[PDB]
Amino acid sequence: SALGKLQDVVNQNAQALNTLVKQLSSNFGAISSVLNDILSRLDKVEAEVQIDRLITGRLQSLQTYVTQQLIRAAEIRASANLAATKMSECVLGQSKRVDFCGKGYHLMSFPQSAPHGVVFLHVTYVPAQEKNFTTAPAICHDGKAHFPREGVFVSNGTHWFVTQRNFYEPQIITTDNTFVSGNCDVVIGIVNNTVYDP
Amino acid sequence: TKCTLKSFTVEKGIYQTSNFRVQPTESIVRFPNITNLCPFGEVFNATRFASVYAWNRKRISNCVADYSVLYNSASFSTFKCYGVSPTKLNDLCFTNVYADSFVIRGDEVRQIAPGQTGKIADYNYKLPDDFTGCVIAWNSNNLDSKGNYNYLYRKPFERDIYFPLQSYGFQPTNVGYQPYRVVVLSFELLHAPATVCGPKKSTNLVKNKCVNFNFNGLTGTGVLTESNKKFLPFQQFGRDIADTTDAVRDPQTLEILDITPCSFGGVSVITPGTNTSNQVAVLYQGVNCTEVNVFQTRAGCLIGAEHVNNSYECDIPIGAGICASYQTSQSIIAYTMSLGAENSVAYSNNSIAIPTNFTISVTTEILPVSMTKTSVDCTMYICG
Amino acid sequence: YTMSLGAENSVAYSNNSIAIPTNFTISVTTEILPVSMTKTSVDCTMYICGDSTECSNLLLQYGSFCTQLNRALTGIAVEQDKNTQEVFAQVKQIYKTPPIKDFGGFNFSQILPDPSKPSKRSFIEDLLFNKVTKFNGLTVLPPLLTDEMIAQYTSALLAGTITSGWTFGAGAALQIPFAMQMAYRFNGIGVTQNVLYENQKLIANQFNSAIGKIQDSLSSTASALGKLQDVVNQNAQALNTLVKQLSSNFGAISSVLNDILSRLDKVEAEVQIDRLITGRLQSLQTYVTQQLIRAAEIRASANLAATKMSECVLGQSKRVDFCGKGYHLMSFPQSAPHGVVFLHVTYVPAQEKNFTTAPAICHDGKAHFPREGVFVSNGTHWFVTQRNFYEPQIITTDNTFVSGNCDVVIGIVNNTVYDP
Amino acid sequence: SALGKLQDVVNQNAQALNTLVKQLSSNFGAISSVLNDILSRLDKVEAEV
Amino acid sequence: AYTNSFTRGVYYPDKVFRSSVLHSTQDLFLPFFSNVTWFHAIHDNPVLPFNDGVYFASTEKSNIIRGWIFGTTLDSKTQSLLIVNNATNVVIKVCEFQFCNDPFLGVNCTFEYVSFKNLREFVFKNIDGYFKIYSKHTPINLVRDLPQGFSALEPLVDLPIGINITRFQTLLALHAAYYVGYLQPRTFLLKYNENGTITDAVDCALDPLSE
Ligand SMILES: *[C@@H]1O[C@H](CO)[C@@H](O[C@@H]2O[C@H](CO)[C@@H](O)[C@H](O)[C@H]2NC(C)=O)[C@H](O)[C@H]1NC(C)=O
Ligand SMILES: *[C@@H]1O[C@H](CO)[C@@H](O[C@@H]2O[C@H](CO)[C@@H](O)[C@H](O)[C@H]2NC(C)=O)[C@H](O)[C@H]1NC(C)=O
Ligand SMILES: *[C@@H]1O[C@H](CO)[C@@H](O[C@@H]2O[C@H](CO)[C@@H](O)[C@H](O)[C@H]2NC(C)=O)[C@H](O)[C@H]1NC(C)=O
Ligand SMILES: *[C@@H]1O[C@H](CO)[C@@H](O[C@@H]2O[C@H](CO)[C@@H](O)[C@H](O)[C@H]2NC(C)=O)[C@H](O)[C@H]1NC(C)=O
Ligand SMILES: *[C@@H]1O[C@H](CO)[C@@H](O[C@@H]2O[C@H](CO)[C@@H](O)[C@H](O)[C@H]2NC(C)=O)[C@H](O)[C@H]1NC(C)=O
Ligand SMILES: *[C@@H]1O[C@H](CO)[C@@H](O[C@@H]2O[C@H](CO)[C@@H](O)[C@H](O)[C@H]2NC(C)=O)[C@H](O)[C@H]1NC(C)=O
Ligand SMILES: *[C@@H]1O[C@H](CO)[C@@H](O[C@@H]2O[C@H](CO)[C@@H](O)[C@H](O)[C@H]2NC(C)=O)[C@H](O)[C@H]1NC(C)=O
Ligand SMILES: *[C@@H]1O[C@H](CO)[C@@H](O)[C@H](O)[C@H]1NC(C)=O
Ligand SMILES: *[C@@H]1O[C@H](CO)[C@@H](O)[C@H](O)[C@H]1NC(C)=O
Ligand SMILES: *[C@@H]1O[C@H](CO)[C@@H](O)[C@H](O)[C@H]1NC(C)=O
Ligand SMILES: *[C@@H]1O[C@H](CO)[C@@H](O)[C@H](O)[C@H]1NC(C)=O
Ligand SMILES: *[C@@H]1O[C@H](CO)[C@@H](O)[C@H](O)[C@H]1NC(C)=O
Ligand SMILES: *[C@@H]1O[C@H](CO)[C@@H](O)[C@H](O)[C@H]1NC(C)=O
Ligand SMILES: *[C@@H]1O[C@H](CO)[C@@H](O)[C@H](O)[C@H]1NC(C)=O
Ligand SMILES: *[C@@H]1O[C@H](CO)[C@@H](O)[C@H](O)[C@H]1NC(C)=O
Ligand SMILES: *[C@@H]1O[C@H](CO)[C@@H](O)[C@H](O)[C@H]1NC(C)=O
Ligand SMILES: *[C@@H]1O[C@H](CO)[C@@H](O)[C@H](O)[C@H]1NC(C)=O
Ligand SMILES: *[C@@H]1O[C@H](CO)[C@@H](O)[C@H](O)[C@H]1NC(C)=O
Ligand SMILES: *[C@@H]1O[C@H](CO)[C@@H](O)[C@H](O)[C@H]1NC(C)=O
Ligand SMILES: *[C@@H]1O[C@H](CO)[C@@H](O)[C@H](O)[C@H]1NC(C)=O
């Protein structure tokens, strides 16, 4: 069931050709589906009326096939433009576009060829073992409100740390991993903790 | 399903097989209850016909005509009809019929058709270019020859009352130079009140039940019902946007019957793959179960699938939030689809979750890029 | 008149002048996308032949034209469910919001579910559903997801977005306080996050007022949802055209197939019925062809809406004008008939001042460059400032980096750099 | 040859209109491609076919 | 003398019920806001042309207008359609008549048929040898002249006469006013309401908005 997008493209094009071939068996109101029956049984003034019913229906049948192949080719081209964009952004790049190259934060993609298609093996970082913490938007020290340069202020219950957002790594809060802006009184939910000066 | 797919193996899914239709229970005939036999003896067997410069039109109305009494007769040299076939005329009926009665030379019958031209057809008996009805003609040398120069000649249905006055020497020794009688029956085949009809006997009326019907020659099939549609006195039929008839005044009791088509809808067939089971469920799309275990979905009446109060991921999508699957002793079940497990995110104005570990996912995305490059030599496909 | 392209504006450019915005506005902008269209199944035998067996036997002479028309409409119909699934089912679990709405002053009540509604739509989803509006083998099939299921998905997308930020797209939803999520959204546009916490009540009021303007716009303006009403109108116009084409003669003595069969005997009737079959089959081929082309346009719009769900709702987008005009902060999905509405929250800078500027600064012969932001003067003093919000900071070895010396840089200026 | 994508769009739309105009010269099985020949040679019921 | 016809002179084009629909038809209607000739029933009944067909109407409280004459020469050298109608009984004939010196009621004959406060409206036309009649009655608030507003004329009678018509005239009585407009081949769009009454119409050749 994995290959279903490529197998359905193979199946749709086979179904379209089999439909086009099977439409040669249709009379369209002629005395026979077989053009050699008409030409072996009827003389030209009578035959040309029957052949024109076959021409009309076979030409309408072939117009129907080509029209649905033009619409299907536009759908394959939209998929090929998407595959060409996935190639550039995720094989030749790393994409910041959420869920463009697999679920999770994109690390890299590898292209593999497949019949009438491409397969991308999207390598993604998925965060996996949550822990809960108390958190603060900012921290009061000498009346100064401190904010983290990178990451978040968190507490294990008794102590306050700064960590990056996507992986728990408790660092001691210092004037190097934080920046000041203004006094405490402006910030909704600021907390009081010492900020160490290295 | 196997015949619909043209296959002996069928995969897990829902397949739109042939459209279900409620069949007509009875065939109803509703015709005007008018008893007179039509005066066609006064049309065909009048002692002398009028001259073609001044042809005579008889209105036939308020009577029953068996057209077989005419068409079965060996007496007529032609009975050519336009817009109707003479075999059908008893099954069908009209507001009025007009008989144009006159005599011509036997050579001239060719001129009496829609779109013709010549010293009758462009001069004294122009038919409409879209004439509906029959030209009936026969040799009358034994009746109308004497010669009998009184058979004078001189837009559609104009009467032609130097000047173009001309005559034929109709003598009994004349064959194309003999007199021929013509009756042209012109049929006023409007969707308006009928008064000339075939001998077809009317049934009783039937309501609230799917029936085949014939009103004054309008064939159809549907549920006849009483209606609020205020037909004005001149109106006999009402139409839909498709020009299909949507209501009728009954020709004997003047009530307005609304016509609804007999109930229909796709028979979707729900199957696990034949690889696993031959057990099957059927959805009558948009049908109500009173019209067909049994389960009314909004998608239609579903039959042969057990309704379950649990919810699961969607296996086979039925519609309107319902799905089906093969589950336990195995059986087809139908259920409201689960969108996913419910989750209270543990939000508070001071709580954060930080991930202490990760997983490297590798996920496979499959994209079409090309399709088979066909080419068709259209001359060899079409003409071989 | 000759159309105006917009007001003419000379930007006040010079080799040394910069405009920095001293204040902002939180814009909420509404984007409306078609996602699906009405799923029609036409029974081509009942459309063409109206349950006449006589006509149905002539329609067999045409082979698999009728079954490949049903196959095409079934592919279109199944694709409407797929389009809808790809937009809304981007959330793996049905997230719900807490009983307490402790969101730091931001007020989602008009976009979150209201339990008093018969389907649990939001106030705005109920405006959206009010403002956007069978017998001849034509039938309409219901969508797989009911509007109540679409509303449970937009509720879960929205409850995930509010309680957890982008994190519910990348894995398990991680809770974070909404003011702290918005402080991340500020860093994601290059605005330093103290600008949120110091202006939090103002930013919350600008958001709440901007959501109020969405309600007023949608309550007053019937033409607001024109893209969705256009899809509904095109589906209706296509079906009405297909129905009215049953009244056409195509050169037959009548367009009513029962007139032909009641008036004419078999050999004459078959010639007239074949004109109706020819024209009705061509009429139905025209409908299915234009529905295949229209389905490809709705699929392009649904792929775009699925991409806006991923990048605007489940994330924050760096793509200019992808998630509304202004620097994207955040987006909220709302369900609408045959579509989705994104309420794109964007930061727009609002109150410029002009300043003198320099690419670099000379101190002790060293050229200093800002680590983040720009050097600016108020006319007498020099400050470093972030690019998108005026906050003048003293120029210091910590907010600058050296490279090389004063001789190289075109337009360097002489100023002290403070050493802490 | 640098602007091939724009010239291809011009050429396709010109080719499509020239094909549509050239199809007026086709008989499709009528006695003439020219509607005035049919109307000058044939009387109503014979012309309409 | 003349007046503006406004939105008057429209009829039910066929005998089929329709409702809640806007239906296109092409037929010999009176054009909207047409310039229609005016006459008085006292001290005014000359011979008029018939053209393709006629709308005729009369503002009334007294039943003075009592019929019509139609044909080519009107002088016994032809069949000529006569219609006498006193609003309780009707007499119709096509015979080779000569009419009286002053056509008022003093209070080869091949076809025959028999059966201010008010406005009577009528329409007359000849197609494929069939002569057709429609009508309406209404109360009127305007005492002086032919009124504004819309209400359609139902069919009455259809005669298989097979005769040419190019002239017409009207019959008075002695012990009101009347109007003549000409029908023209016009597309109209007709609003059939929920009760299948034609309540409004658009004359598609009136002006570019109507088109
Ligand atoms: C929070 O983290 C701090 C620092 O990692 C923990 O403090 C240490 O606790 C151990 C015993 O568990 C002591 O031996 C150390 O001396 C402590 N260090 C300091 C700097 O105080 C603290 O126990 C953690 N609290 C919770 C509730 O997990
Ligand atoms: C954070 O610490 C400051 C002091 O550093 C606290 O401020 C004092 O609060 C008390 C009680 O409201 C007042 O009586 C004092 O006058 C305040 N002193 C100053 C210098 O403001 C503050 O309350 C602490 N905040 C929290 C959340 O605990
Ligand atoms: C969030 O905003 C809504 C309005 O958009 C507030 O709802 C109104 O609340 C008052 C009572 O405080 C009621 O009288 C109104 O009828 C409410 N209006 C509507 C449309 O429901 C709501 O109170 C705000 N929430 C908070 C927590 O402030
Ligand atoms: C920044 O702009 C906002 C408006 O977007 C200003 O806030 C408004 O201030 C006026 C008084 O000048 C009040 O009447 C309004 O009610 C305020 N609006 C809101 C939404 O709060 C704000 O004062 C500006 N700040 C600066 C420093 O320029
Ligand atoms: C440019 O900015 C500086 C610093 O903000 C301004 O200098 C201060 O001006 C105030 C009065 O407005 C004095 O009380 C301070 O003592 C000054 N500080 C210093 C370090 O000089 C300066 O006035 C501004 N100049 C202009 C042209 O706006
Ligand atoms: C910036 O400051 C430097 C000195 O710190 C200036 O350079 C001096 O310019 C004078 C006059 O041209 C010369 O006599 C010195 O020899 C220069 N010294 C050096 C080290 O180059 C420089 O001109 C100042 N720039 C501006 C724009 O004022
Ligand atoms: C109907 O009657 C009119 C006369 O009222 C006929 O019109 C004349 O036709 C001749 C040729 O036959 C022309 O030369 C005259 O110029 C016409 N006169 C007028 C006043 O138009 C008309 O031909 C008759 N039509 C039919 C079908 O009988
Ligand atoms: C976080 O805390 C809440 C408190 O109700 C709890 O329900 C939840 O399971 C905790 N989550 C984790 C990842 O520990
Ligand atoms: C959170 O709510 C508590 C009361 O429940 C309040 O004291 C605190 O200031 C709030 N903090 C934030 C960040 O809103
Ligand atoms: C037809 O039948 C009705 C009663 O069903 C009767 O009133 C009417 O007179 C009949 N008409 C004729 C022509 O006999
Ligand atoms: C006309 O008369 C002949 C005998 O002369 C008779 O056979 C025929 O049935 C009559 N037809 C009609 C319609 O009266
Ligand atoms: C087909 O049937 C086999 C057993 O005969 C079973 O193991 C397999 O899972 C089935 N596969 C599908 C797709 O039905
Ligand atoms: C089904 O039909 C019955 C009448 O036979 C009706 O009472 C019932 O309400 C219908 N239910 C639905 C869902 O159509
Ligand atoms: C489903 O549950 C309801 C009660 O919630 C019960 O009455 C009903 O019988 C159940 N139906 C089935 C098919 O189990
Ligand atoms: C910036 O300076 C130019 C000087 O020409 C002036 O036109 C413009 O209005 C100024 N803009 C602001 C925001 O002060
Ligand atoms: C900036 O441009 C002005 C003229 O607009 C010129 O006088 C000045 O020297 C230029 N400065 C630099 C560093 O190019
Ligand atoms: C009607 O037409 C005549 C000329 O045929 C003209 O004299 C008269 O003024 C017109 N009346 C109106 C109201 O336009
Ligand atoms: C109408 O004329 C007939 C005779 O033709 C007469 O019986 C009837 O009373 C007349 N009606 C009026 C209103 O005078
Ligand atoms: C009827 O026609 C004849 C000629 O066929 C003519 O002599 C006679 O006068 C006409 N009748 C009348 C009433 O004029
Ligand atoms: C239709 O007629 C009924 C009375 O029979 C009336 O109540 C209703 O308002 C009418 N509708 C219209 C659109 O005239």
Describe it.
This is part of a larger assembly, with five copies of chain A. With 198 residues, chain A is an alpha+beta fold. In chain A, 37% of the residues lie in helices and 27% in strands. Chain A has three helices and ten strands, in the order αααββββββββββ. In chain A, the strands form three sheets. A four-stranded antiparallel β-sheet of chain A has the order 3-6-7-8, with no helix packed on it. In chain A, strand 4 and strand 5 form a beta hairpin. In chain A, helix 1 packs antiparallel against helix 3 and helix 2 packs antiparallel against helix 3. The first copy, chain A, is rod-shaped. Chains A and B meet through helix 1, helix 3, strand 2 and strand 3 of A and strand 25, strand 26 and helix 5 of B. Bound molecules: a molecule of 2 linked components (NAG-NAG) (7 copies) and 2-acetamido-2-deoxy-beta-D-glucopyranose (13 copies). The site of a molecule of 2 linked components (NAG-NAG) has 4 residues of chain C, from loops. Chain B: This is Spike protein S1.
Largest sheet composition of chain A: 4 strands, antiparallel
Counting copies of identical and different chains, the oligomeric state is part of a larger assembly
Which ligands, by name, code or SMILES, are bound?
a molecule of 2 linked components (NAG-NAG), 2-acetamido-2-deoxy-beta-D-glucopyranose
The general outline of chain A is rod-shaped
Radius of gyration of chain A: 34 Å
* Arrangement of strands in the largest sheet of chain A: 3-6-7-8
State the end-to-end distance of chain A.
59 Å
Order of helices and strands of chain A: HHHEEEEEEEEEE
Helical stretch tally of chain A:
3
Portion in strands of chain A: 25-35%
SS-based class of chain A: alpha+beta
Q: Biggest interface pair, residues each?
A: B-C, 53 and 69 residues
Q: Percentage of helical residues of chain A?
A: 25-40%
Tell me the number of strands of chain A. Answer: 10
